Structures are given as C-alpha cells and as structure tokens.
Design a protein around this ligand. Structure first.
Ligand SMILES: Nc1ncnc2c1ncn2[C@@H]1O[C@H](COP(=O)(O)OP(=O)(O)OP(=O)(O)O)[C@@H](O)[C@H]1O
Ligand SMILES: [Ca+2]
Length: 360
C-alpha cells in the first residue's frame, strides 16, 4: 500500500504519492459555494456565481467544512484513490495549536477512514528534504512567511517568526506598480497574467538602490512580455521592486520588519550554542523564495546584520517550491518511518491526543 503526502497551503494544495519526486496534484486551496460546491480551478472559473473562500489562513486551517471538502476532492477527484487504503501524511504550519492538529486527526479517521496518518511540521520537512536536521528555515508561500529554527529535528517554538506577507501580496503589488507604469491590471483575469509575469521575470536585486540607478539609466534590465491578447509589453524596474517588498514590507504599507531582519531576530532568540549552526544553515523554502538573486541578497543582508567574524550560508534548492511536499515524500517512504504512523487502531485506543507525540 502506497502512502499519500498531502501538503496544505494558504493558496495551493500539494498532494501526491510518497515515493514520487513531486506532487501529482497542485491546485487552488479554494472552495466556492453558490450565492453543491466547487474546488480549486473550477471554483475560480465559476466565481461569478459563487462565494469563493479560503479554508487555510496564514497556513492555519480555519474553516473545517471547506477543508473537509478540499480533502475529499483531493482524494477522490485529484488523486483518484480510496482514502481507506492509504496511510496519509498531512503537513501543518509552525505553531499550529494542539486543538487544530487534533481536529485534523479526527477528520482523517472519522471522515475519511484512513488506516493511518501523521502530521509533520512543514518547515521540518523542507529542512529534511535538504539533508539536514539542524538549521533555520525561511518558508515563504502564498499567504504567510515564517522563519523556523530547527535543532536536531525539533522546531524551537519560542524563536519562530511570522510575517504576514507572501506570494499573493507580491502579485497584488505587481499589478499595482505595472498600473503606475501605464498599463491596467485590475481584473482577476489580469491578476493571473501578473502572477505569471511575476514568476517569470521578477528577481531580487543585490543592492536595491543601485538597481534603480541602473534601471533609470538604460534598457539593459528591461524585458518584453507577450499577453494573451497578443500584446507585447515592456517591464523594467518592476521586476526587482515587486520582490523587494520581502525586504521592505513598508512598500505595501506594513510596519513589520523584512525577511532578513525576521531571520536574524529568530536566530537571536536561540542559544548562543546553536546560533552558530543556524547561520551556516539558512534553508529557503516555498514558492515565494524562487526569485533569482534571492540567495545572494539574503546572504548579504545577514552578513551586515550579524557579527563580522560569523560564517553564514544560505541554501536555495532548485525544487524548493514543493520542497515541503518532497520532504514528505522522502519521509513517508523511509524504512524506519513505517513505525511512526498513527494507526486507526492506536487512535481508537488513545483518541486524537496521540497525534502530538511526533518527531516531525
Ligand atoms: N517562480 C516563482 N517565483 C515567485 N513566486 C512563485 C514562483 N512559483 C510560485 N510562486 C508563488 O508562491 C506562492 C505559492 O507557494 P506555496 O505553495 O509555497 O504557498 P502556500 O503553501 O500555498 O501558502 P502558505 O505557505 O502561505 O500557506 C504563490 O503566490 C505563487 O505565485
Ligand atoms: Ca506552505
């Protein structure tokens, strides 16, 4: 019997089979009901006649009925499996409450009748995907950014940092600044294009000011882009200005500190002991960390932030968009992991609190 790895995100569901090198299903974490309900991409196209909702906010599940619907659709329509024949690894946000996590367990067992499940912290899986059990994870997704410092495979809860700004915000901002340029991107259809420009053409500048200086001088940083109506459009300084929001959340009117600073502050909240280890083990995770240049930029910013003698390293795996899912695939496939599943039997005996004595 194969295991299913199912990574729930604010914006995207990543789901598939343990042992695969990537998720078979990737789709909007969206439920739509009329103004008898619809999931993912169907929900989006039919948004004119539905109330679209997000069951996961900032990585935390907040609407249980819609989450149930998401999972149903995942098992039955996306992966086309019988959930009662498959151990299921689910993933969770950092600092997910005990009540939440227990509720996930109950639903799997009572609603979906799985024979076994597990719940693993997403940052741990990412860090595990990179062959590490110690380090600090920057997980930037669609709806939230976390810094998660992990030591010997255990996340340090007092040092976790949250920044309420990620992918969907960068998309909205890119819409906004392209519209300043002279285009118009206001409509949902137009949001999807901006999303595609963003993932294709954006990048983090090594020195921000210096980049504006180059961009206000020549075409050397401009790129063309062809639209779905056939129109070609020039995009210039908007390429590095959009992802710069990650370092300067004040660009979208946010008081919060940037990702370099939140990373730094996270490490600062840890033992001197292990602070040295975290610095040489910054691992970047999630769709929003995909920008070219992101590695070097973070590299630089931590260097100027941290003691001058300190050795610092940033790890950006090519596949880090699904590296949480991948970590799950490796984990759920291991010889030794097989003893860690919470079986339906163990659940009937213990109840949902059993879920907490995990290692991941
Ligand atoms: N090449 C890319 N460059 C920049 N952003 C990207 C790229 N590919 C995907 N993204 C963005 O990453 C986000 C989705 O990533 P991910 O699945 O890691 O987040 P999530 O798990 O859905 O949300 P969260 O982690 O906040 O709950 C989307 O906003 C998407 O636009
Ligand atoms: Ca995520």
């Amino acid at each position: 019997t194969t295991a299913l790895v199912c990574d729930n995100g604010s914006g995207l569901v990543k789901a598939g089979f343990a042992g695969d090198d990537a998720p078979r299903a990737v789709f909007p974490s969206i439920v739509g009901r009329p103004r008898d309900s619809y999931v993912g991409d169907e929900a989006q196209s039919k948004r004119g006649i539905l109330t679209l909702k997000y069951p996961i906010e900032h990585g935390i599940i907040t609407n249980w009925d819609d989450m149930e619907k998401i999972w149903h659709h995942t098992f039955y329509n996306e992966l086309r499996v019988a959930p009662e024949e498959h151990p299921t690894l689910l993933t969770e946000a950092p600092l997910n409450p005990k009540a939440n996590r227990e509720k996930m367990t109950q639903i799997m067992f009572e609603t979906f009748n799985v024979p076994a499940m597990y719940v693993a912290i997403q940052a741990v899986l990412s860090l595990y995907a990179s062959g590490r059990t110690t380090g600090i994870v920057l997980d930037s997704g669609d709806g939230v950014t976390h810094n998660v410092p992990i030591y010997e495979g255990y996340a340090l809860p007092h040092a976790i940092m949250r920044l309420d700004l990620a992918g969907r915000d960068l998309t909205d901002y890119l819409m906004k600044i392209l519209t300043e340029r002279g285009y118009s991107f206001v409509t949902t259809a137009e949001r999807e294009i901006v999303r595609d420009i963003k993932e294709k053409l954006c990048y983090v500048a090594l020195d921000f000011e210096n980049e504006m200086a180059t961009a206000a001088s020549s075409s050397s940083l401009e790129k063309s882009y062809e639209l779905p109506d056939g129109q070609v459009i020039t995009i210039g300084n908007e390429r590095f200005r959009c992802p710069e929001t990650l370092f300067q959340p004040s660009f979208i009117g946010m008081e919060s500190a940037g990702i370099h600073e939140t990373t730094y502050n996270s490490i600062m909240k840890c033992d001197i002991d292990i602070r040295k280890d975290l610095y040489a083990n910054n691992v970047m995770s999630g769709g929003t960390t995909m920008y070219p240049g992101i590695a070097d930029r973070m590299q630089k910013e931590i260097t100027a932030l941290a003691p001058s003698t300190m050795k610092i390293k940033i790890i950006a795996p090519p596949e880090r968009k699904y590296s949480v899912w991948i970590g799950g695939s490796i984990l759920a496939s291991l010889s030794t992991f097989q003893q860690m599943w919470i079986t339906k039997q163990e659940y009937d005996e213990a109840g949902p609190s059993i879920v907490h004595r995990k290692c991941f």
